[PDB]
């Protein structure tokens, strides 16, 4: 449950939904917000596996 709830976290992003980031930002900015979310989700998976 914790692992799935973390998907809704923004981690400092403009929005937690990748489709909103892609729809609202020009790619050079979308990549930054997406990378932020990638870091947040990847850290969540590493925490779960550990």
């Amino acid at each position: 449950n914790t692992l799935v709830k973390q998907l809704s976290s923004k981690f400092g992003a403009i929005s937690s939904v990748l489709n909103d980031i892609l729809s609202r930002l020009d790619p050079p900015e979308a990549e930054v917000q997406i990378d932020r979310l990638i870091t947040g989700r990847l850290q969540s998976l590493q925490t779960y596996v550990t």
């Binding site: 809704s8 609202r24 930002l25």
Partner: protein, 136 residues
């Protein structure tokens, strides 16, 4: 070597999209966001309800994996008739882990449950390439 290996993941792809009647700031078609094209977004008041840019409504497709957009709420899933009883105020349903599992159809106000389209692991059963190249 002989054994079972997890190599990938199966997903069922959507085959069609659903887009869901004002052609006229409120109650008008529009024409924060860095791209120059704002006509594909629905703006609550811009601050990201109404004033949504132009789009063409489609038919409602059920029992198939589809890409839906209901007044700005987008996603991929299988739409089925819901047995849930929404209050006339409520527009969306949520699960115990705060994900969307139901919507009301902007037109006709049908309550639809959203089941995600099936996916799962890909496991390959191999006799071993020193015996046979047939796999399951």
């Amino acid at each position: 070597e002989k054994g079972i290996y997890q190599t990938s993941n199966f997903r069922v792809q959507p085959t069609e999209s659903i887009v869901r009647n004002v052609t006229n700031i409120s109650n008008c078609v529009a024409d924060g966001v860095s791209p120059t094209k704002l006509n594909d977004l629905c703006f609550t008041n811009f601050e990201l309800a109404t004033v949504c840019g132009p789009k063409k409504s489609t038919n409602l497709v059920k029992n198939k994996c589809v890409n839906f957009n209901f007044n700005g709420l987008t996603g991929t899933g299988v739409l089925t008739k819901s047995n849930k009883k929404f209050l006339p105020f409520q527009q969306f349903g949520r699960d115990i882990v705060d994900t969307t599992d139901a919507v009301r159809d902007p037109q006709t106000l049908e309550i639809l449950d959203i089941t995600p389209c099936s996916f799962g692991g890909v496991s390959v059963i191999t006799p071993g390439t020193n015996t046979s190249n047939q796999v399951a």
